[PDB]
Amino acid sequence: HTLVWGVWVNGVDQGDGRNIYIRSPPNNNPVKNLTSPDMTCNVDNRVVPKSVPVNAGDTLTFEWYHNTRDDDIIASSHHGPIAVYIAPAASNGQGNVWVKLFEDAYNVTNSTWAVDRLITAHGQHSVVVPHVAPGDYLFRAEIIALHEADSLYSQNPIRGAQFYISCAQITINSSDDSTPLPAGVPFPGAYTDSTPGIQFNIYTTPATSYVAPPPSVWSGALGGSIAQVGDASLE
Ligand SMILES: *[C@@H]1O[C@H](CO)[C@@H](O)[C@H](O)[C@H]1NC(C)=O
Numbered sequence: 181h182t183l184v185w186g187v188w189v190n191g192v193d194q195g196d197g198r199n200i201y202i203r204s205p206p207n208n209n210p211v212k213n214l215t216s217p218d219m220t221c222n223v224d225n226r227v228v229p230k231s232v233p234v235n236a237g238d239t240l241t242f243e244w245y246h247n248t249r250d251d252d253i254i255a256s257s258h259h260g261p262i263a264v265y266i267a268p269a270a271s272n273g274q275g276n277v278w279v280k281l282f283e284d285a286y287n288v289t290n291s292t293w294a295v296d297r298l299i300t301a302h303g304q305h306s307v308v309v310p311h312v313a314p315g316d317y318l319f320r321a322e323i324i325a326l327h328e329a330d331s332l333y334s335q336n337p338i339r340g341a342q343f344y345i346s347c348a349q350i351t352i353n354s355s356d357d358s359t360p361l362p363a364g365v366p367f368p369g370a371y372t373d374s375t376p377g378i379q380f381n382i383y384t385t386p387a388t389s390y391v392a393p394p395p396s397v398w399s400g401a402l403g404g405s406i407a408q409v410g411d412a413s414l415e
């Protein structure tokens with residue numbers, strides 16, 4: 181159970197973005213229905229009044245929270261991977277538009293899931309803004325909590341993988357457009373019951389055997405990391 185508070189650009193806090201440049205849902209409940217239109221940008225998908233201005237090669241950091249800024253972030257029980265996608269704002273996220281910029285699942289060396297490292301990073305994870313065409317974009321940050329993912333929601337609606345999805349409105353101002361954005365996957369539609377990494381037993385299956393859902397990260401990406409960039413409590 182987690183939400184996005186706002187973003188930082190190049191280590192500078194852009195301020196509270198909820199319902200301003202983040203298409204915030206009304207609460208921190210997960211999305212579980214893989215076929216639902218809620219899979220695109222969560223349950224209140226509408227244009228919000230501002231977009232954060234960035235340039236290609238900028239570092240964009242999402243900051244998640246549970247109940248209040250810079251708290252426990254997300255329950256430690258919620259092991260799973262993190263991904264970030266981009267689409268043009270003109271799509272409103274409909275069709276084969278979403279391109280993967282970042283994926284983190286299990287780190288064998290540290291023996292930690294992306295979600296565990298996000299708690300240590302005080303809710304912060306980053307991508308580098310790619311050299312795409314200037315204009316308006318949607319950045320979709322997705323946390324997948326796998327603690328009830330031994331079952332499929334489609335078969336048992338009280339269990340299943342839990343999706344914590346947030347969409348930020350980003351305006352890319354300065355870019356040469358040297359890596360124009362390629363065709364994307366649809367949300368809903370990319371994840372199905374047979375997709376690797378949607379049905380997984382984290383209690384019995386070694387985390388080293390986990391494969392994150394396709395698609396793979398775009399070669400044009402520069403992303404990116406889970407790591408604290410700024411101290412919230414100095415503001
Ligand atoms: C899942 O979402 C689809 C498409 O919106 C819908 O038809 C179906 O009723 C949903 N399943 C449940 C259990 O609500």
Ligand SMILES: [Cu+2]
Nearest residue numbers: 181182255258
């Ligand atoms: Cu939760």
